[PDB]
Amino acid sequence: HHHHHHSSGVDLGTENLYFQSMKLIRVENFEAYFKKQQADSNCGFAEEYEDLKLVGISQPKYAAELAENRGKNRYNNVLPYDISRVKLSVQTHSTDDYINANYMPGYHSKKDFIATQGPLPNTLKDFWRMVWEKNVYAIIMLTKEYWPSKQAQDYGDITVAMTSEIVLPEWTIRDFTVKNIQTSESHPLRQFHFTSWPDHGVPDTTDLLINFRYLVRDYMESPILVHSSAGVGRTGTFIAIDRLIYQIENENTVDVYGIVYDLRMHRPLMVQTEDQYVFLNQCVLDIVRSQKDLIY
Ligand SMILES: [Cl-]
Ligand code: NI
Ligand code: NI
Ligand code: NI
Ligand code: NI
Ligand code: NI
């Protein structure tokens, strides 16, 4: 009974959704389209990106604005929308449910990812609770510590213990156990840490992002938790490329505009600069160029 179509003049956000929330390009036409869009200092891509700027930002975020939850946001202007926020269980009051995090769609489902900020000192117990309560098995950390290394640490009613650390040049892979001290139930956890993605910036090469993503997929119901400082820019770019690669492999099509549109509908600022958006397109170009008769 929830399936309905809106009349005009009811929600201008929904009208935009129906009208222009997609720009689908077949891979066979993508090199020609990329050439057009990158001309004159990326004018075409800049227009796509500026058309995305107000998407999603009219949605309510009352929980995020509660006085009780102010200390739980890193920035007073990066706030989770109510509709997609990760709601935690409650012990003492309703606001116990709050964390600056959102469910983000991936290629396969609407809860494929949780996008969140790197924990604060006062939200560290909440962050590991989320990991526990939402059955997270993979964490993706994009930066340029909230976990133990030496011995087990308790964060609230959860104990975390490190079981492996492999340091590589571009990234680190850490394994943990996450154990509810009240119930004794333990889950495994793998953390994939990309170690030089600059804030507001992009990795040094497209291979680094693509190969890191494929590392995440080869080394993994349950959400993938992605975080960065604000939980939007690098986090959104990561999720986007993952969605794009699946769309290229399974469909023969690309929709960077539509995937970022969809991200913005679930959390603010996803893919936070124009260069990150252009970078997603250069990633696609390089994937397309690498996947590419005698006459008698
Ligand atoms: Cl950082
Ligand atoms: Ni229904
Ligand atoms: Ni439905
Ligand atoms: Ni219908
Ligand atoms: Ni409606
Ligand atoms: Ni900054």
User: Please, which residues bridge with residue 117 across strands?
Assistant: 228
Give the amino acid at 249: E
Q: How far is the CA of 279 from the centre of ligand 4 (A)?
A: 36
Cα(10) to ligand 5 centroid in Å equals 9
CA distance 47 to 208: 27
User: Tokens 């960065």 map to which residue?
Assistant: 228
Report which bound ligand comes closest to the CA of 228.
1
- Decide: residue 230, CB within 10 A, 0-12 exposed, 13-18 middle, 19+ buried: buried
Give the type of residue at 230: A
One-letter amino acid of 52: L
Q: Are strands 224-228 and 138-142 parallel, antiparallel or unpaired?
A: parallel
Distance 80 CA to ligand 4 centre (A): 29
- How close is the Cα of 291 to the center of ligand 1, in Å? 34
d(CA 162, CA 168): 17
Alpha-carbon separation of residue 159 from 97, 151, 193 (angstroms): 20, 10, 21
Q: Rounded to the nearest whole angstrom, what is the distance from the C-alpha of residue 74 to the centroid of ligand 1?
A: 13
- Fold designation for 1-296: Protein-Tyrosine Phosphatase; Chain A (3.90.190)
**Closest C-alpha among 239, 228, 220, 277 to residue 109:** 239
Expressed in angstroms and rounded, the spacing between residue 103 Cα and the centre of ligand 2 is 21
What's the Cα-to-Cα distance from 43 to each of 24, 39, 71, 239, 254, rounded to whole Å?
19, 6, 40, 24, 19
Q: Is 166 left (phi over 0), alpha (psi -120 to 50) or beta?
A: beta
List strand residue ranges (DSSP E) for 143-292, in order: 153-155, 158-167, 171-180, 186-194, 224-228, 253-254
- Interval between CA 290 and ligand 5 midpoint (Å): 43
Q: In angstroms, what CA-CA distances link 160 with 91, 113, 166, 177?
A: 21, 22, 18, 6
101: which strand partners?
116
**Given in angstroms, what resolution was this structure solved at?**
2.3
Q: How far is the CA of 114 from the centre of ligand 4 (A)?
A: 29
Exposure of 89 by Cβ count < 10 A (0-12 exposed, 13-18 middle, 19+ buried)? exposed
How far is the C-alpha of 86 from the C-alpha of 116, rounded, in Å? 9
Q: Of 106, 126, 128, 107, which is closest to residue 115 (Cα–Cα)? A: 106
Residues in contact with 110: Cβ distance below 8 Å, sequence separation at least 6, in sequence order: 103
Domain spans of the chain? Answer: 1-296
Give the residue among 63, 46, 82 at the shortest CA–CA distance from 267: 82
